[PDB]
């Protein structure tokens, strides 16, 4: 009945002047809209039609036309960001926001995607939906005793859209926004569904992305132990987002690293520096490098929970783009660590594999890896010990490539390759 | 493979 019909009949159906009428044209829209091939988003806003499908969100007398005219909006929101701009042009925004506390759950739900997509598409379009007051009336739909009287998927979109008000940066969210969420957001990373775990996740890491007070204010809600409690989780959309977030948190102060040390994160860390999908080892490795950038009684701690060994093995065999997190990893080590640390690393083999990379093209893991070897050689001289070093590069190959690096493009490169053959080998 | 958050979402049914 309303099948496959051509944008021409649908706005004939609109500008009837026939509720009836506008309504089957209205879900007509919306059908062709929800196809997933190349659906027709141009040829609606060309025909005009935004302005007549904003007002039949505000018609409280045809439930079924808000909600028609909801998710057709929605589909065309969620586009690209000429798209989302002619749903917020022709005055979505205020409408949606005032469906939020539609009796009607449904209606509710399409708004609250709605904004959901207009919220992503950018800091400016999210921040205007804050500005619009949509928090408040989102937050109240969550005001509950226990989440799992919620419909499961009204509970992943209302998880998705307030992920979609924590994104972006240039600005990041609103300050007060933040603090808002907050509470709420915590709630939902205790939840048991994967789907609102997941994307809670995400929106911690959002803000968590960013300057070390933005870290604070998440960190001051307790919740680096469910993160870490993620991180074990065996869905891969779940330890995804939750490694991000703890990644961004050690970015911060040593007192904010502590607590992720503290809460049981090294512990994981076994498994997430073997974990099959490259893209877990290469940030579990960056959240490795970024720890052994702290105190040394935080390195003292990656030491005891038997990380140096993986580290030895990422640097061995992985990714390429993981062996430049595990070269960062222990450039740091090597540059904060008391001798007794840094002296453990030759014993558990470093050595070799760092030499083995300095065959790489990249210039600046060559760098890393040089200044490596001179902080690894500061502290075998300490003991007495620098020809040994010298012996075990020469004997692996590596003093061969430090002298080639002699020869390279870079100057930096010169230069640290002749100190360290000028210092330690003749 | 990689897993990534979802910017927008049609919805298809």
């Known amino acids: 009945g309303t099948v496959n019909w051509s944008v021409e009949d649908i706005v004939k159906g609109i500008n009837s002047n026939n509720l009836e009428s506008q309504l089957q044209a209205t879900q007509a829209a919306r059908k062709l809209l929800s196809r997933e091939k190349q659906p027709p988003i141009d040829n609606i806003i060309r ?9 039949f969100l505000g018609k409280t007398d045809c439930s079924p036309i808000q909600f028609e005219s909801a998710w057709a909006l929605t589909n065309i929101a969620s586009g690209t960001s000429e798209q989302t701009k002619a749903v917020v042009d022709g005055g979505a925004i205020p409408a949606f926001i005032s469906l939020l506390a539609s009796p009607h759950a449904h209606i509710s739900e399409q708004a609250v995607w709605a904004l959901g997509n207009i919220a992503g598409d950018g800091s400016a379009f999210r921040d205007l939906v804050i500005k619009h007051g949509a928090i408040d009336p989102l937050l109240a739909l969550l005001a509950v005793p226990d989440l799992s009287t919620l419909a499961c998927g009204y509970l992943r979109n209302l998880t998705w859209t307030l992920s979609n008000l924590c994104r972006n940066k240039n600005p990041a969210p609103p300050l007060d926004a933040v603090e808002q969420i907050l509470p709420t957001l915590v709630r939902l990373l205790h939840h048991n569904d994967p789907e609102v775990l997941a994307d809670s996740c995400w929106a911690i890491s959002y803000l968590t992305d960013g300057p070390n007070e933005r870290i604070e204010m998440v960190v001051k809600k307790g919740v680096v132990p469910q993160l870490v409690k993620l991180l074990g989780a065996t869905e891969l959309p779940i330890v995804t987002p939750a ?3 703890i990644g961004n948190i050690v970015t911060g102060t040593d007192e904010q690293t502590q607590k992720v040390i503290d809460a049981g994160a090294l512990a994981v860390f076994p498994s997430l520096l073997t974990n099959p999908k490259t893209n877990i080892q290469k940030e579990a490795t960056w959240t490795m490098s970024n720890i052994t950038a702290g105190r040394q009684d935080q390195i003292q701690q990656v030491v005891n929970h038997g990380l140096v060994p993986f580290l030895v093995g990422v640097l061995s065999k992985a990714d390429f783009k ?7 990893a222990i450039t740091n080590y090597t540059s904060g660590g008391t001798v007794e640390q840094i002296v453990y690393l030759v014993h558990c083999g470093i050595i070799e594999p760092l030499m083995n990379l300095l065959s790489a093209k990249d210039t600046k893991i060559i760098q890393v890896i040089l200044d490596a070897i001179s902080n690894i050689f500061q502290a075998a001289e300490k003991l007495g010990e620098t020809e040994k070093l010298s012996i075990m590069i020469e004997e692996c190959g590596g003093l061969d490539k430090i002298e080639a690096l002699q020869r390279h ?17 003749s | 493979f990689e897993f990534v958050p979802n910017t927008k979402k049609q919805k298809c049914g």
């Open chain 1, 47 to 55: 025909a005009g039609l935004i302005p007549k499908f904003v007002s």
């Open chain 1, 409 to 425: 493009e870079n100057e930096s490169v010169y230069k640290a390759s002749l100190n360290l053959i000028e210092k330690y080998f």
């Open chain 1, 322 to 328: 993981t062996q430049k997190e595990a070269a960062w």
């Open chain 1, 243 to 245: 490694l991000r977030a």
